[PDB]
């Protein structure tokens, strides 16, 4: 039923400190309720009830507390938690990080109002994702295969081409159309232009939804931006039955805004000063993906990360890898060598790959070839590390085979260029050609029945 | 007029940078070019010879206006800048003119109030954005942004905020991103149709 | 005399270069990673306090 009883408004602001405003004499406070603040100069701001105790409510204000005062500032309480208006009109729109339009179009006519926080899907009703997406990028498709419904973030760093890889994945994804929902947290204007331009250049923009919070926009919008985006993906996937690809741009900007918010409440710190609950918080975003029983649609997530000082042990890539179903790793040392894409396969993973590949799925060799390419690449790295101590004259011919595989793998299998779109079958046969260098008795991940069928070609 | 230092001055549209900022140096202008509306860093350390950047920008660049910011310099290092800058000249319409006809200096020694040391870059960029809005091209130089981040650490330390990374406050990266984001070419507010820009050069001291 | 000296001296050059490469590529990086970890954990203990 509708909220038919009228809203209360209060001038009873008892104190202000950091991002927090504190009202008193509040009639029956509701935890997590939304409050609208009108400042003395007539500026409107919004906040959410972060604590309640008797007659007091504590509000965090999304646009910050600067210029709020104890006497003239006025707060209206909405009677309800944060909900977003959603409709299938939202494809081909641009919004800011709080869901207001920025494309000069109108506000959304809701088909429904949905709770931004979502709601945990029952593990009984989850369907395991098994349909492989071909990205056409060989370093992903052949050695980290993506199932439709996965979470698989791109771990990158400042100055690397993770925008261009994410754009290539959006441009090339298909089964062996996606609707795209794109969120940006803390991006510079040239990053915001790059994506919007690329989606318009590929003609795709009538099938893309963008939420933009730029580097100059309010920080506390960043902690609702991915929840607005994922609520839109959940309507599109689980009510309108679409296949959704969700891109979350720089989760390190989300984590940094979350640290800044939590530091003001003085909640228990974890490693490197992040909130003690950061694992749970990130998990409420990343678990909003997958397939479900009896509905055709699906949500795939590809969050993009910047690793501080390239350190994979930092809490942001660390707690993300603990939740997500793998990672793609973009490497500065490959980027400095002018390779594209810079995907170093060794720190990368896909967990859902193991069941999305093989006989009937892709080809019978795929699970064997992939594991042997990992083994030879790991050994080739170990020989290259030995060479740096002892020099070439110490190496036996068997070491030189792995060190020749290493050079040919990075030029043929990894290196690709920005518009090349390889099949899985091209990726597999480019796999066998590099493996063919080795006498077959060295291929000790591969059983005789696979070798005797595919190596002699 | 009066404007708050921490509020970005509004514009009709914010535009991709295109034209080079000339320094008159062969390296820099050929191998490592900057655009008008660009963002740059230099290593701010003793023997490296920082003054060639500052003097090339001040005397020879295709800037219209120059804003120089000292963030928290040693007493005698600040004195050399304030000695040298008024004595610089350039030639305009076949006549020699002082650099100070197009220049303003923000100056802070390490004993000036810590709130001035932290406000310093926000004063300098707000002064730059005011001449951008007239349809000029402005160059900003910050003498060391490390000396500003130390003032930011002292203020958050005086407030007893949580010490995050290396004692710096949790927002250090958000403040630096929000600062450099004010650089760029723009289509100005208001009726006479015009474009201007602010370019940032900021030294840093690892 | 010169040749038996030369053979012995060639081996000594190879051994010396092998040691220089080990100090530069094995030992110094292991010390620098260790030193970076210690500097990191001391900030964590300080934040806990």
From TrEMBL, chain B:
UniProt: ADP binding residues: 47-52, 74
Residues noted as binding Mg(2+) 1 in the record, renumbered to the chain: 51, 73
Compartments reported by the entry: Cytoplasmic vesicle, Clathrin-coated vesicle membrane
Self-association state and partner proteins as the record states: V-ATPase is a heteromultimeric enzyme made up of two complexes: the ATP-hydrolytic V1 complex and the proton translocation V0 complex. The V1 complex consists of three catalytic AB heterodimers that form a heterohexamer, three peripheral stalks each consisting of EG heterodimers, one central rotor including subunits D and F, and the regulatory subunits C and H. The proton translocation complex V0 consists of the proton transport subunit a, a ring of proteolipid subunits c9c'', rotary subunit d, subunits e and f, and the accessory subunits ATP6AP1/Ac45 and ATP6AP2/PRR.
Family per similarity comment: Belongs to the ATPase alpha/beta chains family.
Chain residues that bind Mg(2+) 2: 51, 73, 77, 143
Residues of the full protein shown: 237 to 442 of 647
Name of the protein in question: V-type proton ATPase catalytic subunit A
ATPase F1/V1/A1 complex alpha/beta subunit nucleotide-binding domain sequence ranges: 24-206
Its job: Catalytic subunit of the V1 complex of vacuolar(H+)-ATPase (V-ATPase), a multisubunit enzyme composed of a peripheral complex (V1) that hydrolyzes ATP and a membrane integral complex (V0) that translocates protons. V-ATPase is responsible for acidifying and maintaining the pH of intracellular compartments and in some cell types, is targeted to the plasma membrane, where it is responsible for acidifying the extracellular environment.
Automatic annotation (TrEMBL), chain C:
Localization: Cytoplasmic vesicle, Clathrin-coated vesicle membrane
Domain of life: Eukaryota
Similarity comment: Belongs to the V-ATPase D subunit family.
Subunit structure: V-ATPase is a heteromultimeric enzyme made up of two complexes: the ATP-hydrolytic V1 complex and the proton translocation V0 complex. The V1 complex consists of three catalytic AB heterodimers that form a heterohexamer, three peripheral stalks each consisting of EG heterodimers, one central rotor including subunits D and F, and the regulatory subunits C and H. The proton translocation complex V0 consists of the proton transport subunit a, a ring of proteolipid subunits c9c'', rotary subunit d, subunits e and f, and the accessory subunits ATP6AP1/Ac45 and ATP6AP2/PRR. Interacts with SNX10.
Function text: Subunit of the V1 complex of vacuolar(H+)-ATPase (V-ATPase), a multisubunit enzyme composed of a peripheral complex (V1) that hydrolyzes ATP and a membrane integral complex (V0) that translocates protons. V-ATPase is responsible for acidifying and maintaining the pH of intracellular compartments and in some cell types, is targeted to the plasma membrane, where it is responsible for acidifying the extracellular environment. May play a role in cilium biogenesis through regulation of the transport and the localization of proteins to the cilium.
Protein name: V-type proton ATPase subunit D
Gene, per the UniProt record: Atp6v1d
Section covered of the full-length record: 150 to 198 of 226
């Amino acid at each position: 039923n509708y909220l038919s009883q009228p809203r209360l408004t209060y001038k009873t602001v008892s104190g202000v400190n950091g991002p927090l405003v504190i009202l008193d004499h509040v009639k029956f406070p509701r935890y997590a309720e939304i409050v609208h603040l009108t400042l003395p100069d007539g500026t409107k701001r919004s906040g959410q009830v972060l604590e309640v105790s008797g007659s007091k409510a504590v509000v965090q204000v999304f646009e910050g507390t600067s210029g709020i005062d104890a006497k003239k500032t006025s707060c209206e309480f909405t009677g309800d938690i944060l909900r977003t208006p959603v409709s299938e009109d939202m494809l081909g729109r641009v919004f800011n990080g709080s869901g207001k339009p920025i494309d000069r179009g109108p506000v959304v006519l809701a088909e429904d109002f949905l709770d931004i926080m979502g709601q945990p899907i029952n593990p009984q009703c989850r369907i395991y994702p098994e349909e492989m997406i071909q990205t056409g990028i060989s370093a992903i498709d052949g050695m980290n295969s993506i199932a439709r419904g996965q979470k698989i973030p791109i771990f990158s760093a400042a100055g690397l081409p993770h925008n261009e890889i994410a754009a290539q994945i959006c441009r090339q994804a298909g089964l062996v159309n996606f609707a795209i929902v794109f969120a940006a947290m803390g991006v510079n204007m040239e990053t915001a232009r790059f994506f919007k331009s690329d989606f318009e250049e590929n003609g795709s923009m009538d099938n893309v939804c963008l939420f933009l919070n730029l580097a100059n926009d309010p920080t506390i919008e960043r902690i609702i931006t991915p929840r607005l985006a994922l609520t839109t993906a959940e309507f599109l996937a689980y009510q309108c039955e679409k296949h959704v690809l969700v891109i979350l741009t720089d989760m390190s900007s989300y984590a940094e805004a979350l640290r800044e918010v939590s530091a003001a409440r003085e909640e228990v710190p974890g490693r490197r000063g992040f909130p003690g609950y950061m694992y749970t918080d990130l998990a409420t975003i990343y678990e909003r993906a997958g397939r479900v029983e009896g509905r055709n649609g699906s949500i795939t997530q590809i969050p993009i990360l910047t690793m501080p000082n390239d350190d994979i042990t930092h809490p942001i890539p660390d707690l993300t890898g603990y939740i997500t179903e793998g990672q793609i790793y973009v490497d500065r040392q490959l980027h400095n060598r002018q390779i594209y894409p810079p995907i170093n396969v060794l720190p990368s993973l896909s967990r859902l790959m193991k069941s999305a590949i093989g006989e009937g799925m892709t080809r019978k060799d795929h699970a064997d070839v992939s594991n042997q390419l990992y083994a030879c690449y790991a050994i080739g790295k170990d020989v290259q590390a030995m060479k740096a101590v002892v020099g070439e004259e110490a190496l036996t011919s068997d070491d030189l085979l792995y060190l020749e595989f290493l050079q040919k793998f990075e030029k043929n299998f990894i290196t690709q260029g920005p518009y090349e779109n390889r099949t899985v079958y091209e990726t597999l046969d480019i796999g066998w050609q590099l493996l063919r260098i080795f006498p077959k008795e060295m291929l000790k991940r591969i059983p005789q029945s696979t070798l005797s069928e595919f190596y002699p070609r | 007029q009066v404007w708050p230092v921490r509020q970005v001055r509004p514009v009709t549209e914010k535009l991709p940078a295109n034209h080079p900022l000339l320094t008159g140096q062969r390296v820099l202008d050929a191998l490592f070019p900057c655009v008008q509306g660009g963002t740059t860093a230099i290593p701010g350390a003793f023997g490296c010879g920082k003054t060639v950047i500052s003097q090339s920008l001040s005397k020879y660049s295709n800037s219209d206006v120059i804003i120089y910011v000292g963030c928290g310099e040693r007493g005698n290092e600040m004195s050399e800048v304030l000695r040298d800058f008024p004595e610089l000249t350039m030639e305009v319409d076949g006549k020699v003119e002082s650099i100070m006809k197009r220049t303003a200096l923000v100056a802070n020694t390490s004993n000036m109030p810590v709130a001035a040391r932290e406000a310093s870059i926000y004063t300098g960029i707000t002064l730059s954005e005011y001449f951008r809005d007239m349809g000029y091209h402005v160059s900003m130089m910050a003498d060391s942004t490390s000396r500003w981040a130390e003032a930011l650490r002292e203020i958050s330390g005086r407030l007893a905020e949580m010490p995050a990374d290396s004692g710096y406050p949790a927002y250090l990266g958000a403040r630096l991103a929000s600062f450099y984001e004010r650089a760029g070419r723009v289509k100005c507010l208001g009726n006479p149709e015009r474009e201007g820009s602010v370019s940032i050069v900021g030294a840093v001291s690892p | 005399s010169l040749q038996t000296s030369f053979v012995t001296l060639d081996e000594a050059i190879k051994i010396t270069n092998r040691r220089v490469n080990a100090i530069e590529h094995v030992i110094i990086p292991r010390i620098e990673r260790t030193l970076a970890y210690i500097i990191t954990e001391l900030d964590e203990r300080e934040r806990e306090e």
